[PDB]
Amino acid sequence: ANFIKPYNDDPFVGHLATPITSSAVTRALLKNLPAYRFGLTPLLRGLEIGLAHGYFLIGPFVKLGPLRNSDIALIAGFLSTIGLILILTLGLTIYGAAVFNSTETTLQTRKAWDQFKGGFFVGACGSAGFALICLSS
Amino acid sequence: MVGAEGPEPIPFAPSKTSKNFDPVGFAERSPEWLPWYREAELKHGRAAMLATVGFVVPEFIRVPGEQFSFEAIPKVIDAHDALPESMIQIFGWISFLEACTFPAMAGLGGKYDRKPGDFSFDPLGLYPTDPEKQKQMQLAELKNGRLAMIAIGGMVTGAAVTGHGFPYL
Amino acid sequence: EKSQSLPFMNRPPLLDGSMAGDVGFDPLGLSNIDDVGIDLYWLREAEIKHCRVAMLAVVGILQVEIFGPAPGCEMATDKCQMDAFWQIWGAHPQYIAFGLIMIMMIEMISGIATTQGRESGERAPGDFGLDPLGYGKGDAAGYARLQAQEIANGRLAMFAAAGEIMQGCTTHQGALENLMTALRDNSF
Amino acid sequence: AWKDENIIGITAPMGFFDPLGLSSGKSDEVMNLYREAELKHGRVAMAACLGWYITAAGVHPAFNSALSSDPLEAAKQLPTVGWLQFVLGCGAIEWLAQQIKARPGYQPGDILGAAYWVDNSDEGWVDYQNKEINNGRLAMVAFMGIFVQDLYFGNYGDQIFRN
Amino acid sequence: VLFIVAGHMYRTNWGIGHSMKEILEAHKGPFTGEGHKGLYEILTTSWHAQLAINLAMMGSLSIIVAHHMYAMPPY
Amino acid sequence: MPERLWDSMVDKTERSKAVPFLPRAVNLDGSLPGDVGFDPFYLSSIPKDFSGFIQPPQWEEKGIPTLYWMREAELKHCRVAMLAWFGWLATDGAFGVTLRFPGEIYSVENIPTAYEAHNALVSQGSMGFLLLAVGFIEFCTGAVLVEVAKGASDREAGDFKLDPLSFLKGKSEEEIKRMKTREIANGRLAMLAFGGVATQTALEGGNHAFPYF
Ligand code: CLA
Ligand code: CLA
Ligand code: CLA
Ligand code: CLA
Ligand code: CLA
Ligand SMILES: CC(=O)O[C@H]1CC(C)(C)C(=C=C/C(C)=C/C=C/C(C)=C/C=C/C=C(C)/C=C/C=C(/C)C(=O)C[C@@]23O[C@]2(C)C[C@@H](O)CC3(C)C)[C@](C)(O)C1
Ligand code: KC1
Ligand code: KC1
Ligand SMILES: CC1=C(/C=C/C(C)=C/C=C/C(C)=C/C=C/C=C(C)/C=C/C=C(C)/C=C/C2=C(C)CCCC2(C)C)C(C)(C)CCC1
Please give, one letter per residue, the 3-state secondary structure of chain D: CHHHCCCCCCCCCCCCCCCCCCCCCCCHHHHHHHHHHHHHHHHHHHHHHHHHHHHHHCCCCCCCCCCCCCCCHHHCCCCCHHHHHHHHHHHHHHHHHHHHHCCCCCCCCCCCCHHHCCCCCCHHHHHHHHHHHHHHHHHHHHHHHHHHHHHCCCCCCCCCCCC
Cis amide bond preceding F211, omega within 30: yes
Q: Tell me, what amino acid is at D47?
A: A
3-state secondary structure of F144: helix
Strands A5-6 and F23-25: unpaired
- Burial string for F128-167 (b: 16+ CB within 10 Å, else e) reads eeeeeeeeeeeebebbbbbbbbbeebebebbeeeeeeeee
C-alpha to C-alpha distance for A4 and C52, rounded to whole angstroms:
72
CA–CA dist F33, F181 (Å, integer): 5
For residues C158-185, one letter each, b for 16 or more C-beta atoms within 10 angstroms of the residue's C-beta and e for the rest, the string is bebbeebbebbeeeebbbeebeeeeeee
Between vectors from CA B12 to CA B8 and to CA B18, what angle results, nearest 5°?
25
- The answer to whether C63 touches C161, Cβ cutoff 8 Å, is no
Closest-CA residue to C155 (of C53, C63, C59): C53
Q: How far apart are CA A49 and CA F209, in angstroms?
A: 93
Residue F56, sorted as left (phi over 0), alpha (psi -120 to 50) or beta, turns out to be beta
Q: Do A29 and D96 make contact, defined as CB atoms within 8 angstroms?
A: yes
Burial class, C153, CB count within 10 angstroms (exposed 0-12 / middle 13-18 / buried 19+)? middle
Strands F10-15 and A16-17: unpaired
Distance D89 CA to ligand 1 centre (A): 28
Choose the closest CB to A25 out of D96, D117, D118: D96
Separation of CA F150 from chain center: 23
**Residue A114: HSE in the Cβ half-sphere, 13 Å Cα cutoff:** 8
CA–CA gap between residue C148 and residue C146 (Å, rounded): 5
What's CA B110's distance to the chain center, in Å? 25
| Chains A and B share 3 or more Cβ pairs within 8 Å | no
Helix or strand run (H / E) with residue F56 = none
- Return the C-alpha torsion angle B66, B69, B75, B78, nearest 10: 10
**Chain E residue with minimum CA distance to F58:** E16
Q: What DSSP character marks residue C71? A: T
Under 8 Å between Cβ of C27 and C6: yes
Task: Tell me if chain E has a CB within 8 Å of the CB of F56.
Answer: yes
The CA-based dihedral angle spanning residues A5, A9, A11, A13, taken in that order and rounded to the nearest 10 degrees: -100
CA distances from F3 to A83, B111, C33, F7, F117 (A): 73, 12, 44, 8, 53
- Preceding amide of D104 cis, omega within 30: no
Distance CA B148, CA B52 (A): 7
Residues 6+ apart with CB under 8 A from B145: B41, B42, B44, B45, B46, B48, B49
Q: With a 6 A CB cut-off, is D144 part of the ligand 7 pocket?
A: yes
F and B adjacent (3 or more CB pairs under 8 angstroms) = yes
Give yes or no for F125 touching E (CB within 8 A).
Answer: no
Long-range Cβ contact pairs of A71-78 (< 8 A, separation 24 or more): A74/A132, A74/A135, A74/A136, A75/A132, A78/A128, A78/A129, A78/A132
CB contact under 8 A, B104 and F21: yes
Please say whether the beta carbons of F184 and F78 come within 8 A.
Answer: yes
- In chain D the first and final C-alpha atoms are separated, in Å, by 47
The C-alpha angle with vertex B137 and arms to B114 and B130, in degrees rounded to 5, equals 80
Among left, alpha and beta (phi > 0; psi -120 to 50; other), residue B12 is left
Reported as type and span, the H/E element at residue A5 is strand A5-6
- Cβ–Cβ under 8 Å, residues B8 and B21: no
Closest CA to ligand 1's atom 6: A64
Q: Say if strands F23-25 and A16-17 run parallel, antiparallel, or are unpaired.
A: unpaired
Nearest CA-CA distance, residue D28 and chain F, Å: 22
Compute CA C39 distance to the chain's CA centroid, rounded to the nearest angstrom.
19
Question: From CA D150, how far away is CA D54, in angstroms rounded?
Answer: 15
F72 CB neighbour count, 10 Å cutoff? 22
Nearest alpha carbon to residue C49 among C182, C150, C186: C150
* DSSP-derived 3-state class of residue F12: strand
CA distance linking residue B20 with residue B6, whole number of Å? 9
Rounded Cα distance between D44 and D31, Å, is 20
- CB burial of residue A114 (10 Å; 0-12, 13-18, 19+): middle
What DSSP element (H or E) covers F24? strand F23-25
Give the residue from B152, B142, B151, B149 showing the smallest Cα distance to B21: B142
Chain E and chain F share a number of CB contacts under 8 A equal to 9
CB atoms near residue C81 (< 10 Å): 22
For C186, other C-beta atoms within 10 Å of its C-beta total 13
- For residues C8 and F137, is the Cβ–Cβ distance under 8 A? no
Does residue B37 contact residue B142 with C-beta atoms inside 8 Å? no
Q: Long-range contacts for A26-35 (Cβ within 8 Å, ≥24 apart)?
A: A27/D113, A28/D96, A28/D99, A28/D100, A28/D103, A29/D96, A32/D99, A35/A107
Nearest to F115, CA basis, from F190, F177, F200, F189: F200
Alpha helices by DSSP H, chain C: 40-67, 81-91, 93-119, 140-166, 175-185
Secondary structure letter of residue E13 according to DSSP: T
Query: CA–CA separation, F53 vs C34, rounded Å?
Result: 24
Whether F59 has its CB under 8 Å from any CB of chain E: the answer is yes
Residues 6+ apart with CB under 8 A from C95: C88
Measured by CA distance, the residue closest to atom 15 of ligand 2 is: B41
When scoring E9, E10, E14 by the number of chain F Cβ atoms within 10 A, the one with the most, hence best to mutate, is E14
As a whole number of angstroms, the distance between CA A123 and CA A55 comes to 9
Q: Are E24 and E39 in contact (CB under 8 A)?
A: yes
* CA-CA-CA-CA torsion sign (D7, D9, D11, D14): negative
Distance, CA of A49 to CA of A119 (rounded, Å) = 8
Provide CB contacts within 8 A for E8, sequence distance 6+. Answer: E17
Neighbouring chains of F at 3+ CB pairs within 8 Å?
Answer: B, C, D, E
Radius of gyration of the CA atoms of chain F, in A: 21
Query: For residue B65, what are the contacts with CB-CB under 8 A and spacing of at least 6?
Result: none
Beta bridge partners of F15: F23
Distances (CA, A) of B25 to A92, B15, F206: 70, 18, 59
* Count of beta carbons in the 10 Å neighbourhood of residue F4: 12
Alpha-carbon distances, residue C103 vs C52, C82, C83, C108, C113 (angstroms): 14, 20, 22, 8, 15
The amino acid present at A96, given as its one-letter code, is G
Whose CA is closest to D78, among D105, D100, D101, D55? D55
Asked if F144 lies within 8 A of C27 by C-beta distance, the reply is yes
Task: Supply the DSSP symbol for C79.
Answer: S
Q: Is the CB of D48 under 6 A from ligand 8?
A: no
- Look at residues F191, F211, F188, F186 and name the one whose alpha carbon lies nearest to residue F201: F211
Backbone angles phi and psi of F73, in degrees to 5? -75, -35
The one-letter code for the residue type at C155 is R
Beta bridge partners of D151: none
Cβ A5 vs Cβ D117: under 8 Å: yes
- The CA distances from residue C63 to A111, C88, C95, C186, D117, in Å, are 120, 16, 19, 26, 87
CA-nearest residue for atom 24, ligand 9, is A127
Per the CB < 8 A criterion, the answer to whether C4 and C24 are in contact is yes
Name the nearest CA neighbour of C18 among C158, C147, C150. C147
Asked if B28 lies within 8 A of D24 by C-beta distance, the reply is: yes
Alpha carbon of F93 to those of C91, F8, F89, F194: distances in Å?
57, 51, 6, 16
Q: Which conformational region is residue D14 in: left (phi greater than 0), alpha (psi within -120 to 50 degrees), or beta?
A: beta
Contacts of F69 by beta carbon, 8 Å cutoff, 6+ apart:
F50, F51, F145, F157
| Chain A residues close to D100, C-beta within 8 Å | 24-25, 28
D140 Cβ partners below 8 Å, 6+ apart? D41, D42, D45
Nearest-Å Rg of the Cα atoms of chain D is: 19
F25 φ, ψ to 5°?
A: -70, 150
Please give the Cα distance from C72 to C66 (Å, whole number): 17
Q: Which long-range contacts (CB under 8 A, 24 or more apart) does C37-44 make?
A: C37/C115, C39/C118, C40/C14, C41/C114, C41/C117, C41/C118, C41/C125, C42/C114, C42/C118, C42/C125, C44/C19, C44/C125, C44/C126
DSSP bridge pairs for F25 = F10
CB F69 within 8 A of CB F48: no
Phi first, then psi, for residue D12 (nearest 5°) are -60, 145
Rg (CA), chain B: 19
Q: What is the DSSP letter of C2?
A: B
Question: Cβ atoms within 10 A of the Cβ of D50, count?
Answer: 11
* For ligand 9, atom 22: residue with the closest CA: A127
**What φ, ψ does residue C104 adopt, rounded to 5°?**
-65, -35
E74 DSSP 8-state letter: -
Question: ∠ at Cα D140 (D136, D142), nearest 5°?
Answer: 110
Pocket of ligand 3, candidates C50, C55, C56: which has the most ligand atoms within 8 Å of its Cβ, to mutate? C56
What kind of experiment solved this structure?
cryo-EM
Cβ contacts below 8 Å, chain A against chain D, sum to: 40
Angle at D41 between CA D38 and CA D43, to 5 degrees: 105
CA distance C116 to chain F (A): 31
- The neighbouring-strand residues paired with E18 are E10
Q: How far is CA B17 from CA B4, B29, D49, F20, in A?
A: 10, 21, 49, 38
Resolution for this model in angstroms, one decimal place? 2.4
Over its C-alpha atoms, chain A yields an Rg (Å, rounded) of 19
- Sequence length of chain E is 75
